[PDB]
Structure 1
């Protein structure tokens, strides 16, 4: 009865997707090919005939390879042969190439699949889009996608999972530009864009998870576990379950300011705990430690506004309060003067699953913490200043302006960027 259409867009998304759909299939119980050898599957799957559980996804890529490999892999006999919409020419790291040019050609074939996936649904609690603030396919398309879906489908909470440009490491030369433009078409057509940055994921899996040389694969499984956790309540059982509509009213604290972080804490190396098992008391502190933050932004330089702590496993109802208490007393952890409360517990029962051949252990607890801390202000201020350096001497604008984007748009985007700045500054200045 609860459904969540998943629009995996761009290489980044299709990749995070094949990591998330494996995690999902295992959790429920379908072999990578459908055919389960119960209402859990429903949230992320739909049965059709003699055991052909198909997913609720729509893989989208203006380029034709990341989805081609999904079409000729092991999960080939799972996704509908029509849900994996590919395309032709790519988006050459060009917001314009997607939003205005190339992109404007597949938008129809994606929103009609979205249409079909939702007429078969009986309770769309929210869409799950997987984008990346790096290039057109992940920026421009997801923008057009959002705008259309925003009105076409309606108030259905479109929640998105984004990979923000890291404050030092990057795989592009135009990322400052691409990302700022994405915000102009996301700060108003989304409700919670749980962000993440590879640089930090490449440290979680380098300081905690003892794993050097991590590839994309071993950096999306962790992203999969965060998303799996935020969608576990509306899938299995629990004690203080949180529906997708409550991860909003209990997180976003003002019209905008809708960008939660993430901190799965019991990330434990495979060959490690032989005589130990984390307990709520410390598993909580772990997520607040300024070193598990999957999005780089000194969490101390700010003021945690609201906080949602999803506990999956043998978490007891009264020990989460013990944790909450100490955390609130810890001086460092500063909570805004406007929010006297500041937590939302979710004691689900299903223990974090184990990708058969990954880097995670079998911990009987978890603390996926989605937090909204002012800190992210700086975490995007960096990108904003990087934009300043390039635009100043009109650099790489020739390419975007020559695909259908008035050069004016860039400046207007910085206006909306500098807006969320004063906004994040404002949502902190202690009440007089």
Structure 2
């Protein structure tokens, strides 16, 4: 059940700080010492899923990859997790991708041999899959992340390749993001087994309103929610539970058609103060709400398939009691059976910061509208040949951009066909 994590680019590596901090905290480890705070939970946990053991200290089964060092360096020195984020786990170059998917895809091909050799060292043959954490708007996380997704699926067929990819804010903070996002989602639609999507617009709004935290100057607290989703969906692998599930079990339950592998996540509660104030169904209803969707959505949309991970103070009586109320309040696609569309997972271990928790992975048709807005941005640049020159002069032809564009458009049509039923 072992999992190897790959962080690519500034965003992917910065997110890795909050994820491994939450993983360490859930396993009673202070991320900095690499040593146990307590042995109290070691015997009801399975630390081997994400953590590698050593007398000097725990090590994450992860690689930290970037085509420029500043993002890793400044994070590993400010938070200063030198021992945990051992630098034998870093694969750094110094070119940068300059926000071009093609430059990242290919400068990365130079480090594929050293990344692959570090993988075969780290991985036990009982490894179940990989997690790839990256942003889609930049160049390294998008291009190199696409390359690693393609590389791992062919280097290790039969093993799972899951992607946790960050979309830009609705008003893009990178003008080249539509090109980079379309190119990456095209690569991932092929080589990924499951793509859990985030966008900063939804994350910024959750942080501003739902947590109402004083103020933020690091992506830290937006990345905390991304780390909460990754940790909670893997909780039943690392802690006892009446109903556990692994990476491919969740992907099999979500991917109805081979191309419907793009997932919207949500978690409740986001503040400890409401963990006291909520029941099982209330956490479920709020997860099925746009105010908790970590992707900018209109409404609940039409759910094709969903996975619900229950953690902590969770009445299984009530968890199965409210399944009728779930289908009663959540609109599902016109082709989904009234008794289907749900995949349950129950882990007895509570999250780091809440008394109960419900994590939702939703295969929703509303992702077609999110993708449609990315496509419309793509076309406003592609139809005017704006910024295409350095994609052309980095070896991605317009012909390759158009090929990725129409395959991306085909995915939008598959989701809309499930949505409309006309």
Q: TM-score range by the shorter chain?
A: over 0.9
Q: Could you say which residue in structure 1 is the equivalent of 2:40?
A: none
Q: Could you say which residue in structure 2 is the equivalent of 1:190?
A: 192
Deviations 1:130-179 (A, max 9, x none): 011111201110111111111111121101101112322x2211111111
1:148 aligns to 2:151 (yes or no) = yes
Q: Could you say which residue in structure 1 is the equivalent of 2:53?
A: 47
Deviations 1:92-119 (A, max 9, x none): 000111113x22322222122122111x
1:283 aligns to 2:287 (yes or no) = no
Measured after TM superposition, the shift of residue 212 of structure 1 is 5.3
SS where residue 363 of structure 2 aligns? strand
CA contact (8 A) 1:305 1:373 kept: yes
Unaligned 5+ runs, structure 1: 355-362
1:370 aligns to 2:364 (yes or no) = no
1:86 aligns to 2:92 (yes or no) = yes
Alignment of 1:190-209 (within 5 A): 190-209=192-211
1:65 aligns to 2:43 (yes or no) = no
Q: Could you say which residue in structure 2 is the equivalent of 1:324?
A: 323
Q: Could you say which residue in structure 1 is the equivalent of 2:336?
A: 338
Q: Could you say which residue in structure 2 is the equivalent of 1:359?
A: none
Measured after TM superposition, the shift of residue 87 of structure 1 is 0.8
1:265 aligns to 2:268 (yes or no) = yes
Match of 2:391 among 376, 400, 424: 400
CA RMSD, aligned part only?
A: 1.8
1:113 aligns to 2:118 (yes or no) = yes
SS where residue 270 of structure 2 aligns? coil
Alpha-carbon distance in 2 for matches of 1:327, 1:188: 32
**Cα pair distance change 1:334/1:273, threshold 3 Å:** closer
Q: Could you say which residue in structure 2 is the equivalent of 1:179?
A: 181
1:295 aligns to 2:295 (yes or no) = yes
Q: Could you say which residue in structure 2 is the equivalent of 1:166?
A: 169
TM-score of the superposed pair, with normalisation by structure 2: 0.93
> How many residues are aligned here?
412
Alpha-carbon distance in 2 for matches of 1:226, 1:63: 27
**Cα pair distance change 1:71/1:200, threshold 3 Å:** closer
Match of 2:259 among 251, 256, 277: 256
Alpha-carbon distance in 2 for matches of 1:338, 1:327: 14
Q: Could you say which residue in structure 2 is the equivalent of 1:380?
A: 371
Most deviating of 372-381 and 149-158: 149-158
TM-score of the superposed pair, with normalisation by structure 1: 0.91
Alpha-carbon distance in 1 for matches of 2:364, 2:87: 41
Unaligned 5+ runs, structure 2: 38-42
CA contact (8 A) 1:234 1:244 kept: no
Alpha-carbon distance in 2 for matches of 1:335, 1:14: 36
SS where residue 89 of structure 1 aligns? coil
SS where residue 103 of structure 1 aligns? helix
Alpha-carbon distance in 2 for matches of 1:406, 1:92: 18
Q: Could you say which residue in structure 1 is the equivalent of 2:244?
A: 241
Q: Name whichever structure is richer in strand by fraction.
A: 2
Alpha-carbon distance in 2 for matches of 1:353, 1:185: 34
**Cα pair distance change 1:33/1:84, threshold 3 Å:** farther
Deviations 1:60-104 (A, max 9, x none): 00011112234435311113331111111110000111113x223
SS where residue 362 of structure 2 aligns? strand
